Amino acid sequence: VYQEPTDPKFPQQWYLSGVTQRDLNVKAAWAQGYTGHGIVVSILDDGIEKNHPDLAGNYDPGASFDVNDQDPDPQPRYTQMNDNRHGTRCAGEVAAVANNGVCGVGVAYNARIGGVRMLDGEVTDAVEARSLGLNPNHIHIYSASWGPEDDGKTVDGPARLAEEAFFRGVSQGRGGLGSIFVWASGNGGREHDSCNCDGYTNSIYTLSISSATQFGNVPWYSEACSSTLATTYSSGNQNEKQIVTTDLRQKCTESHTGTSASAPLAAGIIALTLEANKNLTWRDMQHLVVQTSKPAHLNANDWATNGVGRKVSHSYGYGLLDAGAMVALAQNWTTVAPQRKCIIDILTEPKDIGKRLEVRKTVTACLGEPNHITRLEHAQARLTLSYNRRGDLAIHLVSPMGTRSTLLAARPHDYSADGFNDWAFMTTHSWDEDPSGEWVLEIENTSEANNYGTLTKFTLVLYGTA
């Protein structure tokens, strides 16, 4: 009985609905009756053209603000180069108006969309914190297609205020259910960047989203890491189609590309999911993604089955998001038990790294204590170490059930001699596994050079339930 969008460009939105069965299965969600009605999504970016013919109808002033110029109007700053068209393109992916004879449609075409202009100026910690913490009780989902530089040699993340904003968000946002933070995993593929060296994507508070090309391949810009949760389609080579969305100056574009286009699609699917079940917490949402994401159709050389039988890849997380499955599972979902946190400091003495270091430790996962965990969610390996050439290192973490998470792959451009200072490498690959047993940390020098350094701290942090 459901009638799909009549928008002129909808047929070109191959990733939403297609006969080729290689899409995000969004029409199946719309058919079940979910279009994002009642949900509020905010695009933290370079502004939003609120008067765009395909956005005005869903624009929400309450989900918007201009942090760069300190005013409530997020209108982009126009320039000959159209530098500030990025936020508008991301906004259209999430909630472009449907059946209005203009461009295409958003994943959640009935959702309310707002924008925070915060990238067009000095992006300070305060600027970030005010954006992430904007109207936490009105906005449900925050989408961010930006982050630290992808030169493949930086290690950076949120400063204190932004961290506090994230924490306040998941704790108090949405009436205590927790703000949903969707993050683009990065465009550093050509520089061999790792998204675990990015504190925003690496955070347990954000759903880090990677990309897949139309033909199901790992895009050139893609960054691999264990913190990524799932994937949505984006651009690839010139024989592959790209993302169709709203563009600056009230135009329509069929060339929105890179990691930037994936997070918004995920944000849209999550909006449909919240409509299906408004009581889902920030953790419930991550559980739904893990359970419903599909690897099939995605090519990668590292697909591996984890301890609970799910396929995972460092390029895709658990695979492609499936909107129909997301909204279906959401309706019947029982809120997960309170989050427990088990801290296990592993080292009893510093360890020389040399050419290779292996640290084994059998843990009980806080057995007999209030934070005993039998069903893992995120896991962090907080490492502090010195090394002469950081990029030559490759670090792996093996769970008791045999799941190998590569916390850090070699980064050829990273010649830093600063090592890691209590950096929290995170992995989503052992989700739902029993964490008790022997964990193994492996640090190896991937180069032939005679490198040297010392691992002075290894703290294993487990999050989960019993």
The DSSP code for 119 is: S
247: annotated active-site residue: no
Which of these is catalytic: 17, 226, 260, 430? Answer: 260
Establish if 46 lies at the interface with Ca ion (CB under 5 A). Answer: no
Establish if 203 lies at the interface with Na ion (CB under 5 A). Answer: yes
Distance of alpha carbon 255 from the chain centroid: 22
| Site stretch for Na ion (CB under 5 A), options 33-41, 122-130, 171-179, 198-206 | 198-206
Q: Is 193 annotated as a binding residue?
A: yes
Q: Is 102 annotated as a binding residue?
A: yes
Establish if 208 lies at the interface with Na ion (CB under 5 A). Answer: yes
Establish if 66 lies at the interface with Ca ion (CB under 5 A). Answer: yes
Compute φ and ψ for 421, nearest 5 degrees.
Answer: -115, 95
- Which residues within the stretch 99-118 sit at the binding site for Ca ion (CB under 5 A)? 100, 102-103
Establish if 380 lies at the interface with Na ion (CB under 5 A). Answer: no
Which of these is catalytic: 45, 60, 247, 322? Answer: 45
Q: Can you tell me whether residue 226 is helix, strand or coil? A: coil
Quote the least distance from Cβ 6 to Na ion, whole Å: 37
203: annotated active-site residue: no
Residue 7's binding partner among Ca ion, Na ion, none (Cβ under 5 to 8 angstroms by kind) is Ca ion
C-alpha span between 263 and 268 (Å, rounded): 9
How many residues bind to Ca ion according to rule CB under 5 A? 15
Quote the least distance from Cβ 4 to Ca ion, whole Å: 13
Q: Return the sign of the alpha-carbon dihedral for residues 250, 256, 261, 267.
A: positive
Q: Is 186 annotated as a binding residue?
A: yes
Structure-token match 């059930």, residue found: 401
Give the one residue of 187, 206, 399, 445 binding Na ion; rule: CB under 5 A: 206
The answer to whether the CB of 234 falls within 8 A of the CB of 258 is yes
Compute φ and ψ for 406, nearest 5 degrees.
Answer: -90, 105
Please say which residue, 88 or 277, places its beta carbon nearer to Ca ion: 88
Which of these is catalytic: 42, 60, 64, 86? Answer: 86
Please say which residue, 7 or 322, places its beta carbon nearer to Ca ion: 7
| Site stretch for Na ion (CB under 5 A), options 130-138, 207-215, 247-255, 432-440 | 207-215
45: annotated active-site residue: yes
* Interface positions with Na ion (CB under 5 A): 203, 206, 208
* Interface positions with Ca ion (CB under 5 A): 7, 54, 66, 69, 71, 73, 97, 100, 102-103, 150, 186, 188, 193, 198
Q: Which residues are catalytic?
A: 45, 86, 260
> Residue positions in the annotated binding site for substrate?
46, 83-84, 128, 145-150, 156, 184-187, 198, 200, 260
